Design a protein around this nucleic acid. Structure first.
Lengths: 49, 53, 53, 47
DNA sequence: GAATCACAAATCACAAG
DNA sequence: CTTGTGATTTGTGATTCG
DNA sequence: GAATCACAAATCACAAG
DNA sequence: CTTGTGATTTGTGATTCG
């Protein structure tokens, strides 16, 4: 379903890795950040989703 | 950790609802949003893209 | 009002447990901590020091 | 559990300074009391 | 639509007593 | 110490860019 | 959420038939 | 003049870029 977004900070070096890889092999940074976040929450906060 | 001590930030826009969950968890049990982002993304790279670290 | 309009802010200390309650509440529901502290404080002044506002 | 800091409007902060200086007290004291009475008033459940 | 900015909130850590 | 506050970091609506 | 690609389908144009 | 082919031009879903 549709869902709004919220700006957050991430460490520059980690952002770059994702930037280079997504430009190299398709995708965008946001997609990845979302997935990383979800997976972190599934891991540490499984109750919450 | 000289490199890391002067490491700065990029911004990124995540799903609000995923952000809300973190906003409340860190409020309750400490830390903050950026910390969660950093760990979340470090662990993801470590998981799927270890060569890059 | 002139003084509110023009001046900035000033750091202040508070009980951690009371602060925490507001941090959780604002995380869950809308708003931010400062917002609440400024109301708290204004209401304190309008009650115990009415002649100063 | 200790202290946390917060940045309040400087005009309201001034008022408190003047008062705590003139009569007894300190800024933290007022804060603590300001906030405590606010919670009681508006968020009584949270104790 | 993602990506980035710019100014506010929030916290840090030294200063003052 | 405890309290006070300027410096610095973190948060996010606003803006950019195509 | 517009700019710029890419490609095809009109539009052109000259000449042959 | 009428009409087929190839040649610029035009309008467009698709895609790039933030």
């Amino acid at each position: 379903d549709i869902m709004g977004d919220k700006t957050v900070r991430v460490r520059a070096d980690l952002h770059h890795i994702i930037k280079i890889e997504t430009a190299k092999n398709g995708g965008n940074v946001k997609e990845v950040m979302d997935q990383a976040l979800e997976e972190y929450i599934r891991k540490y906060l499984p109750d919450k989703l």
